[PDB]
Symmetry: D2
Subunit: 336 residues, 4 copies
């Protein structure tokens, strides 16, 4: 029998993690918690605007919903500490609500009976922040709370690591041209968090916004802590994003071909490499955490001084989710 997973917050990441977990043996979602009725949950699992119809069968049943014959218990409890995790034998909670993004707060799940908690976002507190295939080996299995970092962090980390390992990273600035997300308002309206830019119509604007991804890349790659920073422009695509990274390197006389070859060599199931002139919708549903795009590599040289820019695609939904589920699996396998 599988590792028993409970998803807290059946949102974009929660539901896609659910879908992704269907295709990973030894992981089962036995429970889902949100703030809504079961008809809504089943409906949002079946139908997904950007990610497509769920392929299996979804049925509403007493106390939850059944997916391909398998019963998922569901709950409507805003306070995680009151969830029946001890009774259900939860091995790991995928904390995907956006409201427990901190070690202390996530501990609610451990009190409620979960053995571990993996947060679908950056989190404050004394915990590890993990981008799979960049630093997942920093896990030893004894962690009770882990962060899977952010989508952007997952797109950035393998890129920054190659730049650092192969060229020496001096410093850099990043912009992610990022799809709009649920914390953005549909029409211009007050924003819960006081952000005057997330306050504006999501799908009608280029919207500058913050992110920690680059500032907190040091949590994932300690040897470059403090060397990156940058922000985001939220733009009107519902999913699919691009990280542009502009860097100063230690190596001199760096060429486009050298940067690209180095990226290619470091490719794996988390870090994709393409030379095709693709655009954002081509990466919707992709399971790479980061797709390095060699067509966008630039090297500006003035005398002995070089700036190097690179760009990596990610589906800020599915790319992140696939990374999150890998980390989940690995976290489980090490714990047993």
């Amino acid at each position: 029998m599988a590792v028993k997973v409970a998803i807290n917050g059946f949102g974009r990441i929660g539901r896609l993690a659910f879908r992704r977990i269907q295709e990973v043996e030894g992981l089962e979602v036995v429970a889902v918690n949100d703030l809504t009725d079961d008809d809504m949950l089943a409906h949002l699992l079946k139908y997904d605007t950007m990610q497509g119809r769920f392929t299996g069968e979804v049925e509403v049943v007493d106390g939850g919903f059944r997916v391909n014959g398998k019963e998922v218990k569901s709950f409507s409890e805003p306070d995680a500490s009151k969830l029946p995790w001890k009774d259900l034998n939860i091995d790991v909670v995928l904390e995907c609500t956006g409201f427990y993004t901190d070690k202390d707060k996530a501990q609610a799940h451990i009190e409620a009976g979960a053995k571990k908690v993996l947060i679908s976002a950056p989190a404050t507190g004394d915990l590890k922040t993990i981008v799979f295939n960049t630093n997942h080996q920093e896990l030893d299995g004894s962690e009770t709370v882990v962060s899977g970092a952010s989508c952007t962090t997952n797109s950035l980390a393998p890129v920054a690591k190659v730049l650092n390992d192969d060229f020496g990273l001096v410093e850099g600035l990043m912009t992610t041209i990022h799809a709009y997300t649920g914390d953005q308002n549909t029409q211009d309206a007050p924003h819960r968090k006081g952000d005057k830019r997330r306050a504006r119509a999501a799908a009608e604007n280029i919207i500058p916004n913050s992110t920690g991804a680059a500032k907190a890349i040091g949590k994932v790659i300690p040897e470059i802590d403090g060397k990156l920073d940058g922000g985001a422009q939220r733009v009107p695509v519902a999913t699919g994003s691009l990280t542009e990274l502009t860097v100063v390197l230690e190596k001199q006389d760096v060429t486009v071909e050298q940067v690209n070859e180095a990226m290619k060599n470091a490719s794996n199931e988390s870090f994709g490499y393409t030379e095709d002139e693709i655009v954002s919708s081509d990466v919707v549903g992709m399971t790479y955490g980061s797709l390095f795009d060699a067509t966008q590599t630039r090297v500006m040289s003035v005398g002995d001084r070089q700036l190097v820019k690179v760009a990596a695609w990610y589906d800020n939904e599915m790319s992140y989710t696939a990374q999150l589920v890998r980390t989940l699996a690995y976290l489980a396998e090490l714990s047993k």
Copy 2:
């Protein structure tokens, strides 16, 4: 000195009502209530994605904000019954939160000290529902709570009235191809009201939805109560909407020219008439409650049996708001 208006809910309609009130003498907004800080409020008044920069000067001051030298007191009180309306001499509350859409609930403003309440939506309970220039003369000045109807009701009313007055309305069905609004989710997510369609990405879908507009047109035009019904398709424009009305008329041998001439004759500052082949973005900001579009008139005749279809544009924002503020002005003038 002016009629003293308080806007409850500085939302899309609230803020646009504020802007529209700036250009109507004898009306002042002296107070605004919402659920946010003053920086947000001032910012959302200044900048508006679809409706353009606010032309005057907006400044944050102690206890509110100043618009062109005029002080607006602001509040952060989700329970209307606790607002200082008595102390401020509120003559009318523009109820624009979407949460007091019922005579009894809106009564909280009366208890708080407001003389009158006008609700920016259809509302249940023993009150009048008013589309300016279609039934505003049903007001006598003694009403304490009034509904300004919906945007769709305001687009539909003058059209249905002409159809009825001039041709006899037997029955009809309506569809409004309607811009998305703030009650719709940015990304597929749980919907507060359990509506599986309003739950979906607002700007990425054709989304079928309900409305009362047609079913409750009887509140505005009693002589055609129960003769209309229909729904909405929410589509990805951030504002600007079209109402398509398909009717069976008692008059025989009706022609396109007849329908069109009849609409033109009935035109005023609430009901515009056009023969130009416009599209939705051409009516953004317009102050007609309803723009009859003659180019879309159709008459299908099979023997003696005719179906007649017409279409009317409205800016679900500014068109409704202009109607609302006319009704507010009139309600005030009759009260004195």
Copy 3:
């Protein structure tokens, strides 16, 4: 060996017909003609914004491109009469350029050597217009030029037939809320055809437009010729469309349940039936020609007089394409 297909115009419908043909045994595309280089053709086959990555392998070769090991000859010839159809043994041309939508013009392919021509649109001239599973049996195999009708015609036909067969169709009007297409301008600009509405920014507007679908439904269902008419509102989704049909029926005391059951009974691989509260993106990629949506049925009754409204979803792209390919297959099978 398969029926030998040439696709003229590797556009939206051309490429999707290509994809669809890959999964239908006894049909092969041996030739493609457009107005561009092979790199472009291959690229647009591989990547598709709304329809997803092509699953197989696509490679540019000398004189064309190779798909999963199979060679496709390609051409760049604007005058179809000059195509090497005789030399290539073309059994059927999928005419998908939008520029040969007439029997006489399409004859260019017969002169160039193709045995038959099937047009991806309504076409003038002495030829048959075919919606698969509604009137495809009107084909005997001796036709040299055939039209596959339009996307709208395919969504409307099975619906209209069931209304007529089961209830008696007196008359009706139709609106399709339709995704924007390639003959719509990106930004407001002159339009090649003089259409002041198709001239406007496709993805920023609700745009009223014509269609023949309903006026020429008589070509597909002769027994209701002249009884339907209507138009379109083009809206900003890149694909996925909805047909609303409002009708007068002969049968009295018709209920929603009756209309819905009658539609359900008529369902097949061309005509789907759903009771789920889906939205346009849920039909992207679907292969039904028409998805009847029971949640949108309405019956308006005033005394003895009834209006009945129904709505059917279609992917104006894939739904039409799947229909087109079925008709192509059938046309081939009857010819041999």
Copy 4:
């Protein structure tokens, strides 16, 4: 009497240039040329998706259209060399077709009888490239063909000049997150220029693309020739754009406040300054060629090595047009 202007290509820039010219005394548009009928031209002048209704009156007359009582002659001649510029006394052609972007080609207008040509784009050949208020004083009045550079170049120039003048520009890389434009396809289709990216659905994608803006900034600012490079991401807003510039400076220990103060001091009617948290739709219609946005300034410092990033907004339409008309006015004034 005014400088007699003829607009070649009544497109986005052409029509907006027309509108802008209505509010600049001593400039008249007496003639317009495009590839379409007068009804379309007049319609597209009246109605504008992003830029709003034309305020004055537009009327179709014999041989052109009348704007506020003033006759504009119109033509339908793809070959500029055949235009009746001698007969009409054209002082300056605003070359806005996108098809004459080269000194030699634009010379067709001089042969046709125009005294001068100003091109609404970067242009090859022996001519000056002008960004108003950055290098317009490089004009002496004897030029017959001039380029007004690109929208991006206009947003970047005043920024780059300040960085250079005040800090010493070593090198930099730029990204413009740019609104989609008319040479982008509506749906994925072959692209006239073989660009596999401009080939994609303009409003559904983040689309990487080239620009010369930065590489040819050296035409406008010769003292920094060859020190900048960069590209674009076309995203789904219909207008309004942001230029991010990441730079290495000679001055050490630069702060955010220094960069911002430096930008503020250089502000004028071409180069605006804001500290407001605006978004793209807030700059639609603005007449600054560049709006420097202080909220986005970043300085990354690792020991003694700094990267400085800044961003300036521009309405790629109206910002560019306003700059183009300023350069037109000035070019005329010096010529007389």
